[PDB]
Structure formats: structure tokens, C-alpha cells
Amino acid sequence: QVQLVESGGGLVQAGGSLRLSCAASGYPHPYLHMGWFRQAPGKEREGVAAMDSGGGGTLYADSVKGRFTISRDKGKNTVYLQMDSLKPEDTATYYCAAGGYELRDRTYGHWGQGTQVTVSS
Ligand code: NI
């Protein structure tokens, strides 16, 4: 019952910055987190960042600590991922997810289609 639409992906120079957005239709259940995950070809899906809709507390993967920032706009029911100091190994499809807990992907039952991010060398 929740639809999620990512935007902001595409092509960026290594060292550069992007900001992804995720527009959501409904509210997260059965838990209250919104999360960004990413999946590169041949690899497992990886958690990137998550935040508690209940009380705005945030969690990051070690891989992106100090470079990425998650935030939200309650009024717009949108979350954001600010992605700075990008590297070629950050290339992936980035997904927004709702209704899970922290970076436990199996707890999320609502997923976007994903937005591709490609960072040069
Ligand atoms: Ni549902």
C-alpha cells in the first residue's frame, strides 16, 4: 500500500555530490524506519542509511560514514540522501525502502524501483 519513487540519480564525477529524493505515498509499517540501500551488479544489497520516522534518529553504513547524510521532510512525506565525496565504488542502483528497522533489509516490505548512480573514474 506504500509506493516509493526515487529521483536524483544519474552520472557524476568522482569526488562530486548528488542528492537523491524519495517521495512516499503511505506510512511506514510494521516498523517506522525509512532506509536507503544500494545494490551493485553481482553483489548483495547493502544498507546505506536509515532514519526513524518516529524520532529522527539516523544510522549509517561504515562504507558511507562522514560522506552521506539522510534527512526527511514530514510535510512532504519525502526522505533525502545527500551523497558527497563520491567514489567509483559507490556506483549502484539506490533504493528507497519503508516500513523496516535500521539497515535490516529483510524487515522492509516496501521498496522503490531504484535510481541508478554512476560515478566516474
Ligand atoms: Ni504494507
Please name each of the domains of the chain with its CATH number. Answer: 1-121 (2.60.40.10)
Cα 108 to middle of ligand 1, angstroms = 9
Between the CA of 54 and the centroid of ligand 1 the distance, in Å, is 17
Residues with Cβ–ion distance below 5 A, ligand 1: 1
DSSP labels, 37-77: EEE-TTS--EEEEEEETTT--EEE-GGGTTTEEEEEETTTT
Q: State the structure-solving technique.
A: X-ray
Hey, which residues does 116 pair with through a beta bridge? 93
Cβ atoms within 10 Å of 18's Cβ, excluding its own: 19
Residues 79 and 7: beta-carbon distance below 8 Å: no
Structural contact between residues 50 and 61, judged by C-beta atoms closer than 8 angstroms: no
Report resolution (Å) to 1 decimal: 1.5
Q: How many residues does the chain have?
A: 121
Cα 71 to middle of ligand 1, angstroms: 22
C-alpha 29/C-alpha 75 separation (Å) is 18
Q: 64-103: string of b/e by CB count within 10 Å (b at 16+)?
A: beeebebebeeeebbbbbebeebeeebbbbbbbbbbbbeb
1 C-alpha to ligand 1 centroid (Å): 5
What separation in Å is there between the alpha carbon of 22 and the centre of ligand 1? 17
Minimal CA–CA distance to 81: which of 9, 16, 27?
Answer: 9
The alpha carbon of 67 is separated from its chain's Cα centroid by a whole number of angstroms, namely 13
- How far is Cα 111 from Cα 34, in angstroms, rounded to an integer? 10
Taking the C-alpha atoms of residue 90 and residue 110, their distance in angstroms, rounded to an integer, is 23
Whether 9 contacts 83, CB under 8 Å: no
Quick check: 39 and 45 in contact, CB under 8 A?
Answer: yes
